[PDB]
């Protein structure tokens, strides 16, 4: 799921960068190292918006290693899975236990053991994909999955979905 | 928190602990090739460069002095007096 | 699992490596490039400087007695609570073997090495169909 | 692997790393062995 | 308190009484190996910003 | 979870950096694709300001042109943007703008109303089975009437 | 070194003490410790579920701690647990249990005289805890009946026994005199039935200390590092006391588990667990007065946990409040009427050893390059180069590499050199002038030489007094010395 | 079987809070404990020995009168009196015809309801599909 | 799932977390070893056994217990 969110950050500006234009490297470090990052707590930070009015209030020198550290608060957008709401995405990869579906930036995994039993993997697809009587679910096939699991080890998310019910499976 | 600049009540001088910690970090930073806001006239010792900047009030740091309750005043080394 | 650690200079890699332990620095170093592999070495003689599993194995022991600050209504029960688990262990016949043979070889005026081999030679066989008792002397004999 | 987990709180998100003297980390682990919990918190609640 | 005289009995009461020990003493900071708010440690060093114009 | 139990960070009572409470922001699955482009461009004018001193064909160049403006590691951000276009179901903000006009009388929790927009929903039995919190919020009438507008409002390419 | 991690690095601001809930122990524990054996039953690696299974931390600097990985110098050791057959007192709280029992009806769990008493209105005033429980226990310790109502109230009506400690036992006598010694389970059960509002008032805290936690039910088994083994001469891999007492606990537990599953002489049991209660007690503290010293197979006592912290040499006094340190030297001092007031003469032999890690900058890189050519031996030389990546290199054992390229931000551990400030100290050192900072001057033979005037603050003379030297290892502790 | 789940046989004595549900697919006596566990995952067979009716937890429901013959007929009537609510007796008025049309609708219902040979009911289900068109018509 | 080589169980979410584009099947970070399912046969088989044991009390005590619940004296 997508949101826009108000987040904060702590970045340590190593002492070399302390010239007049430090603020530049701060934002530079920000986008370059906050965009496109998974976090267990918030999700994939996608777009740092409001690139103007980001709060950069004041830095503290850490006693040893003498590097400044700043607490920057900002606004951005995040793809955040959950459990129990339908999500759409085309498959990309596949396996014998299922097929990974790439949704947003998260390659969801839907495992047949959660999908409706009528489509047991007919392994005969090349490229591998599942062939069911109602529809044949291919690699770039559109699929509507409800998410029936998630995991957030920090700086990572893997979720779990199923299409066992109606309005589900292929699209 | 954050006593306003017109209400700062603490001493306008630099305590010798402030002077020692300032020159420490400033020297430490210089020793990490932080830029230098003064003409190192032949100097190569980071502590001695720091003593030079401080004598020219060119150290871009600021002292956050905590009161016993928790609030604090902020002085910038450029405005504190050194002895 | 294999739970195993090996050191090798990731910047020479040439071998099962040529490393040396500089103890007095608490280091191990690639004897080629001198990269220090791992440090904070832990001492190896001071350990036992401050100070029998071949017989007493894994079931451990500890001599429990009476301190200065205990009256006889607690001391003797330490002598009356220690006695409940002397038969789950055949170890009476293990230790009382040693104690006996210790009482023997020592009374026999023998070198304290023989005492061990007999403290061994009991423990190694220590129960066989060939043994099956047989007076429990002949072995200690 | 870049994964952390305080099971017993089932937390895998709210983790911190601290530097302390090993002889302290010992001490705490011996207050635990006597059933004292010396929880350490990195922010103030009494304020 | 535990570091002076009767270390364990003090530590027990704390654990029973759920003492919350706020780590402002020099002695607490020493155990944690932190910078005690003492002398040079009695303030923070903030990185000035306006003076970074030059 | 499903029952509208999002994380405490995403609790309906949200806070901005200036402290006052506000509405939780949740996005329909393509106007989010729009605001992104606005930002990336608003940076593309901006990143280049400091630098100074069907649509399916063009989206990639639209995308990848903005890519160099950003950190380049983000075709995985495009992995959503590509998705966001492939699974885009709007355009022309007023499409949503009117739709967002249309929806936001819903009296529904934002994860729902965003989900309803985001979702390619043909049936009204769909919601009460797809979004099972959506079984007694709005009935199939007020649901599908919007869906039936949504069908035409599904502006396709 | 120590491998990069990602968790955000903070600093401790608060310690919340508090007891340990047996559920918490189990939720923490990575392993149910069951068999007293340490090693594997085949004189090989280690008994799983034994007294140090590999899922606890590991040592040998050669294995990986299959719970959390490898480094014997990263794994902090993970805690395992034992669940006792039957509950026992925690020695630290017997007194604070006997005291407590005298303040609550031993049948319903309610408190004795409450705010309807006047002085309870006067007791529950106290904002202090440890005196609230103190003053309360003066009022409640002498009433003996769970009264019912004295309007200007709870009941339970029972007479309340009188209690006395006697070597890990609390024996209560009523009057009706039932001098029946009290089971723990009753007390445990008693406690589990006390009002939050009661023990709160009593001085506890329902999040961090329920009174029912002073009675041990589960047992937390410290990982190996708390009690390491001395692997000595391939068979004298001696074991720490805490391993023994733990074995001896685990046995005395293992036994008593049977003695209920197999018969019940019901006086052997009453001693059997009262034995195990003794082992747990002396494990925590083997120094208990009114009790028998739990000895070793050398007949010496067992180093209890409490003993590890008690006096000097304990953790606190001898390992936290003060400790031994690197980068120091100690030798005999001599006088010198030819050194300035602030110099100290350092033997060249010592200066070759102590070392100071300097950072390569534009202002010294060539000069530092020179030192690295001198290498370890000739004096103004160096002994290690530290690469920005946290990587270190011995300069001997690198002549093979020969020439080395320095780069900015690398660190060179040079020898100490003239004018480096060092901290000089003469023990006992009972005032701040017994530690002043001097400037090095490197001289021949092996005494520290100092000016004569400086001698009266240190309170030294030259009949063999020795003084200690401490070298500062940073650019900022240096300035602390020179300026303060 | 009267008050215990035909699956786990948890008696109303042993689980007084047992709440029985059945499904329009098969109308099976069962406790909710199984119900959730069975279809918390999704569309599968009914947990009955001899039931391979694939059915789904949203379709689940609560009996009222325990008469699975009436209730199905009630359901049949409910199915009818939903679409066959388009019946004309008051809309017809002719006392014989209003009797007849009711009789006709009921005969159509009874055909579905009597269910003994319900294929003319299936033909009436076609007529009910036609009624789905006739209630539309 | 479970790696017998480490003898340690795992669950689905670990597996997908442990899964790879290359290895469509599961390794074991402890063992680097493919995993095996578990609880499939035994527990299903187990619970049915106790179900009869649970049934063993149905005509027995619990029925007669309700035969006490008639008056509960
Ligand atoms: Mg003398
Ligand atoms: Zn090498
Ligand atoms: Zn470990
Ligand atoms: Zn009472
Ligand atoms: Zn059931
Ligand atoms: Zn394994």
mmCIF file of C-alpha atoms in Angstrom, chain F residues 3-154:
data_model
loop_
_atom_site.group_PDB
_atom_site.id
_atom_site.type_symbol
_atom_site.label_atom_id
_atom_site.label_comp_id
_atom_site.label_asym_id
_atom_site.label_seq_id
_atom_site.Cartn_x
_atom_site.Cartn_y
_atom_site.Cartn_z
ATOM 1 C CA UNK F 3 -9.653 -5.252 10.034
ATOM 2 C CA UNK F 4 -8.064 -1.857 9.580
ATOM 3 C CA UNK F 5 -5.268 -2.402 12.068
ATOM 4 C CA UNK F 6 -2.273 -0.676 10.557
ATOM 5 C CA UNK F 7 0.904 0.024 12.470
ATOM 6 C CA UNK F 8 1.174 2.579 15.223
ATOM 7 C CA UNK F 9 3.318 4.603 12.854
ATOM 8 C CA UNK F 10 0.359 4.541 10.475
ATOM 9 C CA UNK F 11 -2.334 5.088 13.049
ATOM 10 C CA UNK F 12 -5.299 7.100 11.775
ATOM 11 C CA UNK F 13 -4.200 9.782 14.229
ATOM 12 C CA UNK F 14 -1.101 10.970 12.390
ATOM 13 C CA UNK F 15 1.208 13.875 13.135
ATOM 14 C CA UNK F 16 3.244 16.140 10.905
ATOM 15 C CA UNK F 17 6.652 17.587 11.693
ATOM 16 C CA UNK F 18 4.962 20.726 13.048
ATOM 17 C CA UNK F 19 2.994 18.621 15.502
ATOM 18 C CA UNK F 20 -0.665 19.266 14.730
ATOM 19 C CA UNK F 21 -2.693 16.180 13.942
ATOM 20 C CA UNK F 22 -3.817 15.604 10.384
ATOM 21 C CA UNK F 23 -5.429 13.045 8.142
ATOM 22 C CA UNK F 24 -3.469 9.948 7.326
ATOM 23 C CA UNK F 25 -2.505 10.149 3.669
ATOM 24 C CA UNK F 26 -3.281 7.056 1.607
ATOM 25 C CA UNK F 27 -3.128 7.039 -2.164
ATOM 26 C CA UNK F 28 -5.104 5.595 -5.037
ATOM 27 C CA UNK F 29 -2.858 3.380 -7.063
ATOM 28 C CA UNK F 30 -2.182 5.847 -9.911
ATOM 29 C CA UNK F 31 -2.471 9.418 -8.656
ATOM 30 C CA UNK F 32 0.416 8.358 -6.470
ATOM 31 C CA UNK F 33 2.054 7.655 -9.792
ATOM 32 C CA UNK F 34 1.099 11.250 -10.582
ATOM 33 C CA UNK F 35 2.398 13.010 -7.480
ATOM 34 C CA UNK F 36 5.699 11.169 -7.898
ATOM 35 C CA UNK F 37 6.135 12.541 -11.417
ATOM 36 C CA UNK F 38 5.233 15.981 -10.127
ATOM 37 C CA UNK F 39 7.963 15.651 -7.533
ATOM 38 C CA UNK F 40 10.546 14.114 -9.849
ATOM 39 C CA UNK F 41 9.877 16.867 -12.356
ATOM 40 C CA UNK F 42 9.661 19.529 -9.672
ATOM 41 C CA UNK F 43 13.120 18.263 -8.868
ATOM 42 C CA UNK F 44 13.934 18.054 -12.564
ATOM 43 C CA UNK F 45 13.349 21.765 -12.813
ATOM 44 C CA UNK F 46 15.053 22.134 -9.427
ATOM 45 C CA UNK F 47 17.977 19.710 -9.661
ATOM 46 C CA UNK F 48 18.724 21.428 -12.935
ATOM 47 C CA UNK F 49 18.251 24.900 -11.426
ATOM 48 C CA UNK F 50 21.253 24.433 -9.153
ATOM 49 C CA UNK F 51 22.844 22.519 -12.034
ATOM 50 C CA UNK F 52 22.632 25.762 -14.005
ATOM 51 C CA UNK F 53 24.820 27.600 -11.495
ATOM 52 C CA UNK F 54 -0.017 5.713 -26.330
ATOM 53 C CA UNK F 55 1.656 7.030 -23.178
ATOM 54 C CA UNK F 56 3.137 3.529 -22.789
ATOM 55 C CA UNK F 57 5.720 4.524 -25.379
ATOM 56 C CA UNK F 58 6.715 7.825 -23.778
ATOM 57 C CA UNK F 59 6.462 6.905 -20.099
ATOM 58 C CA UNK F 60 9.848 5.167 -20.216
ATOM 59 C CA UNK F 61 11.636 8.231 -21.536
ATOM 60 C CA UNK F 62 9.506 10.311 -19.173
ATOM 61 C CA UNK F 63 10.659 7.903 -16.490
ATOM 62 C CA UNK F 64 14.279 7.402 -17.486
ATOM 63 C CA UNK F 65 14.817 11.099 -18.214
ATOM 64 C CA UNK F 66 13.883 11.735 -14.591
ATOM 65 C CA UNK F 67 16.046 8.733 -13.695
ATOM 66 C CA UNK F 68 19.309 10.585 -14.342
ATOM 67 C CA UNK F 69 17.889 13.443 -12.280
ATOM 68 C CA UNK F 70 17.628 10.888 -9.439
ATOM 69 C CA UNK F 71 20.085 8.384 -7.942
ATOM 70 C CA UNK F 72 19.973 5.832 -10.747
ATOM 71 C CA UNK F 73 19.579 2.885 -8.361
ATOM 72 C CA UNK F 74 15.862 3.414 -8.665
ATOM 73 C CA UNK F 75 14.631 1.417 -11.611
ATOM 74 C CA UNK F 76 13.466 -0.493 -8.549
ATOM 75 C CA UNK F 77 11.651 2.734 -7.756
ATOM 76 C CA UNK F 78 10.678 2.463 -11.399
ATOM 77 C CA UNK F 79 9.768 -1.149 -10.613
ATOM 78 C CA UNK F 80 6.914 0.619 -8.899
ATOM 79 C CA UNK F 81 6.747 3.448 -11.440
ATOM 80 C CA UNK F 82 6.707 0.919 -14.264
ATOM 81 C CA UNK F 83 4.081 -0.927 -12.290
ATOM 82 C CA UNK F 84 2.417 2.387 -11.480
ATOM 83 C CA UNK F 85 2.044 3.032 -15.192
ATOM 84 C CA UNK F 86 1.183 -0.524 -16.216
ATOM 85 C CA UNK F 87 -1.394 -0.666 -13.441
ATOM 86 C CA UNK F 88 -2.271 3.008 -13.748
ATOM 87 C CA UNK F 89 -6.033 3.510 -13.773
ATOM 88 C CA UNK F 90 -6.383 7.298 -14.146
ATOM 89 C CA UNK F 91 -4.690 10.374 -15.598
ATOM 90 C CA UNK F 92 -5.132 14.090 -15.700
ATOM 91 C CA UNK F 93 -5.437 14.808 -12.017
ATOM 92 C CA UNK F 94 -9.022 16.085 -12.174
ATOM 93 C CA UNK F 95 -9.849 12.552 -13.274
ATOM 94 C CA UNK F 96 -8.900 11.661 -9.745
ATOM 95 C CA UNK F 97 -9.552 15.279 -8.797
ATOM 96 C CA UNK F 98 -13.189 14.784 -9.650
ATOM 97 C CA UNK F 99 -12.965 11.189 -8.441
ATOM 98 C CA UNK F 100 -11.290 12.386 -5.266
ATOM 99 C CA UNK F 101 -13.989 15.003 -5.281
ATOM 100 C CA UNK F 102 -16.404 12.112 -5.741
ATOM 101 C CA UNK F 103 -14.990 9.690 -3.188
ATOM 102 C CA UNK F 104 -14.137 11.927 -0.288
ATOM 103 C CA UNK F 105 -17.688 12.308 0.859
ATOM 104 C CA UNK F 106 -17.441 8.564 1.522
ATOM 105 C CA UNK F 107 -17.215 8.753 5.290
ATOM 106 C CA UNK F 108 -14.727 5.890 5.048
ATOM 107 C CA UNK F 109 -11.331 5.176 6.577
ATOM 108 C CA UNK F 110 -8.571 6.280 4.173
ATOM 109 C CA UNK F 111 -7.109 2.828 3.639
ATOM 110 C CA UNK F 112 -10.549 1.906 2.349
ATOM 111 C CA UNK F 113 -11.343 4.915 0.186
ATOM 112 C CA UNK F 114 -7.864 4.758 -1.282
ATOM 113 C CA UNK F 115 -8.285 1.031 -1.777
ATOM 114 C CA UNK F 116 -11.602 1.499 -3.566
ATOM 115 C CA UNK F 117 -10.048 4.022 -5.902
ATOM 116 C CA UNK F 118 -6.917 1.957 -6.363
ATOM 117 C CA UNK F 119 -8.924 -1.150 -7.146
ATOM 118 C CA UNK F 120 -10.159 -2.259 -10.566
ATOM 119 C CA UNK F 121 -13.581 -3.080 -9.146
ATOM 120 C CA UNK F 122 -16.268 -4.276 -11.576
ATOM 121 C CA UNK F 123 -18.712 -5.873 -9.119
ATOM 122 C CA UNK F 124 -20.092 -4.486 -5.881
ATOM 123 C CA UNK F 125 -20.042 -7.943 -4.354
ATOM 124 C CA UNK F 126 -16.329 -7.445 -5.044
ATOM 125 C CA UNK F 127 -15.692 -5.036 -2.169
ATOM 126 C CA UNK F 128 -17.564 -7.018 0.469
ATOM 127 C CA UNK F 129 -15.380 -9.933 -0.620
ATOM 128 C CA UNK F 130 -12.179 -8.184 -1.710
ATOM 129 C CA UNK F 131 -11.922 -5.578 1.033
ATOM 130 C CA UNK F 132 -13.826 -7.398 3.761
ATOM 131 C CA UNK F 133 -13.987 -4.323 5.948
ATOM 132 C CA UNK F 134 -16.114 -3.064 3.061
ATOM 133 C CA UNK F 135 -19.181 -5.185 3.728
ATOM 134 C CA UNK F 136 -21.324 -2.774 5.763
ATOM 135 C CA UNK F 137 -19.699 0.633 5.267
ATOM 136 C CA UNK F 138 -21.307 1.488 1.917
ATOM 137 C CA UNK F 139 -23.834 -0.768 0.252
ATOM 138 C CA UNK F 140 -23.573 -2.027 -3.305
ATOM 139 C CA UNK F 141 -25.859 0.775 -4.492
ATOM 140 C CA UNK F 142 -23.721 3.714 -3.405
ATOM 141 C CA UNK F 143 -20.755 1.461 -4.076
ATOM 142 C CA UNK F 144 -21.528 0.441 -7.612
ATOM 143 C CA UNK F 145 -23.124 3.706 -8.642
ATOM 144 C CA UNK F 146 -19.648 5.083 -8.058
ATOM 145 C CA UNK F 147 -18.151 1.968 -9.628
ATOM 146 C CA UNK F 148 -20.449 2.518 -12.575
ATOM 147 C CA UNK F 149 -19.141 6.041 -12.796
ATOM 148 C CA UNK F 150 -15.726 4.526 -12.156
ATOM 149 C CA UNK F 151 -16.113 2.259 -15.181
ATOM 150 C CA UNK F 152 -16.348 5.281 -17.463
ATOM 151 C CA UNK F 153 -13.991 7.092 -15.101
ATOM 152 C CA UNK F 154 -11.566 4.285 -15.885
#
